[PDB]
Structure 1
Amino acid sequence: VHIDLSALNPELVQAVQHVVIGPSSLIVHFNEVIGRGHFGCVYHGTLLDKIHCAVKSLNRITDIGEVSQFLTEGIIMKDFSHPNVLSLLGICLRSPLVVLPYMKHGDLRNFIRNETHNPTVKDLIGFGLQVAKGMKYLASKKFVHRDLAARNCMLDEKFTVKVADFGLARVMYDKEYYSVHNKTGAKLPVKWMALESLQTQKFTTKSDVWSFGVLLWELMTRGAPPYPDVNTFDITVYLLQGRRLLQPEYCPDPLYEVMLKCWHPKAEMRPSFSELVSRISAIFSTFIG
């Protein structure tokens, strides 16, 4: 796969040079798969400042407009610095690669579903609070995630949760994968979407708050798939009728109250990420477990 750099706006090509990592500074281990995805796979990699990293290839990119958006996103993300947000180490254009820090304990969904790890309810509430802190930071930068889910959060060697994306939620938002037609597989993005996002394809920080509620539900169920008996074509009407994900067995009542507030049918009535951090920190700090 070859990209015509001359088909891109030259101003954008120069503006992204601080994010660019040259091919000679990076070795990709194509036989060491960290995660396989619809828009590209994640592999183990080695970066030269010797750093162990994760390298994400972009597989289904077909037009120069998607490459322009990829560069525009690289400029935005390069500036982010928060302990609960995955850093962007850099990008490669010569097929496009995203270079991320290596996360020893992988994605949050597989971690909480893991039999050996067995996190306690308190640990799971702690992971939820860390996600809320990363989202409070992203909301402060006016950055809309669009696909916040446990499968998109990663854990480092200290069990620090980092908000991230294994898909391309902000580049490929118009693709079939992010619509109700993606009806097969575990990663069904439509089951994390706010009611207004399902109806009008509008995504805001308030629709990320809805997804955060679904993510808290995934943490409390240790990675159960949401709405198992509701088809992707029926989720909109199910939510419009006022039906919601039920309270998990180990979920404390004040945390389910939080989830119901995240799933408010009126986006403007949902709590902010700043309110979510205060509320979850108070539940966590007095928690005995």
Structure 2
Amino acid sequence: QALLRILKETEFKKIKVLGSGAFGTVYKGLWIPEGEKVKIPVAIKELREATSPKANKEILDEAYVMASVDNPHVCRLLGICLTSTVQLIMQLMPFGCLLDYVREHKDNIGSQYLLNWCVQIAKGMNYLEDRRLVHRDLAARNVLVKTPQHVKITDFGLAKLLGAEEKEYHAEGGKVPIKWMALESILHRIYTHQSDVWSYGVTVWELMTFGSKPYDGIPASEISSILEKGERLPQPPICTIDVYMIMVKCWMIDADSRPKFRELIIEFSKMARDPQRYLVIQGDERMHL
């Protein structure tokens, strides 16, 4: 197995809590590696305590999968701290997650950034697939902006190997939001790369709507029926039909008829070459020839 860096609680401190959840608490903080002047801003994810021996065996699995992935569009682990409670330490992304980012800047985002982000997210998922990993929680909130030109996937807490037995530690946490999940996931607790492709669909939709809540104001109990009827999220205003066609293929009920991530890379790369053809945004200017 891998060798992970282990840090002393004294090497760093938690300034403030970026977020809170069933998973646990994640803080913003500062980290001075020993024998180094440099001060590094970090995110510190303090996990929830396990409530069973088997979950207590598994609570660190998250850190090992995160440490084993090496890809520019997937976030990495700096190390763990075990002193009292389990803490994963990662690089802070000061621009924050994409969901908030597109909300903060809905007036200022050009078509080229939106389509390049879709390419980057798909590349990272395609990497995870090559490694037999199923993320199970892809969402705009789980994509972080290192830079406008660089975005990364994250929240590996629910990630698992394809076909693996469900972990006892995953079951002791809160449930995934239904509104990003594929129908087969909802009905039978099946998860695959193709169920991740569905959540990519919703994620794209979130970005193209500049951060709207999927199925807003609807009860999660209705969602399974809606999907069975055949109803799907609407075409975002800025999207041409080519873009919406792609989202809609991601929500097809036969999982093996949805696109593969490698196909999404090709399609969205093509659009990102000529972005104003595929996304129509006011204030988006293409220079005259």
TM-score when scaled to structure 1? 0.84
Inter-partner Cα distance in structure 1 for 2:257 and 2:10: 48
Inter-partner Cα distance in structure 1 for 2:224 and 2:65: 32
After superposition, the C-alpha distances for 1:107-148 in whole angstroms (9 at most, x for unaligned) are 111111114873223322221211111111111111100010
Inter-partner Cα distance in structure 2 for 1:249 and 1:116: 13
Inter-partner Cα distance in structure 1 for 2:141 and 2:18: 13
Preserved CA contact (<8 Å) 1:39 1:60? no
CA separation of 1:23 and 1:216: change in aligned 2, threshold 3 A: same
Inter-partner Cα distance in structure 2 for 1:119 and 1:62: 44
**Aligned partner of 2:157: which letter?**
L
Question: Could you tell me which residue of structure 2 aligns to residue 185 of structure 1?
Answer: none
Question: Could you tell me which residue of structure 2 aligns to residue 209 of structure 1?
Answer: 197
Question: Could you tell me which residue of structure 2 aligns to residue 83 of structure 1?
Answer: 72
Deviation at 1:157, TM superposition (A): 4.0
**Aligned partner of 1:111: which letter?**
Y
Question: Could you tell me which residue of structure 2 aligns to residue 97 of structure 1?
Answer: 87
Partner of residue 136 from structure 1, selected from 93, 112, 126: 126
The worse-fitting range, judged by mean Cα deviation, of 226-235 and 43-52 is: 43-52
Structural mapping, 1:103-252, within 5 Å: 103-115=93-105, 118-157=108-147, 159-165=149-155, 168-170=157-159, 172-175=169-172, 177-178=174-175, 189-252=177-240
TM-score when scaled to structure 2? 0.84
**Aligned partner of 2:261: which letter?**
F
Unaligned runs of 5+ in 1: 1-14, 180-188
Question: Could you tell me which residue of structure 2 aligns to residue 9 of structure 1?
Answer: none
Preserved CA contact (<8 Å) 1:91 1:99? yes
Question: Could you tell me which residue of structure 1 aligns to residue 254 of structure 2?
Answer: 266
The worse-fitting range, judged by mean Cα deviation, of 248-257 and 153-162 is: 153-162
Partner of residue 59 from structure 1, selected from 48, 56, 64: 48
Preserved CA contact (<8 Å) 2:50 2:172? no
2:60 counterpart SS class: helix
- Alignment length, in residue pairs? 263
**Aligned partner of 1:246: which letter?**
P
**Aligned partner of 2:228: which letter?**
L
Preserved CA contact (<8 Å) 2:99 2:140? yes
Identical residues among aligned pairs (%):
36
The worse-fitting range, judged by mean Cα deviation, of 113-122 and 240-249 is: 113-122
RMSD: 2.1
Runs of 4+ aligned residues of structure 1 deviating over 6 Å after TM superposition are none
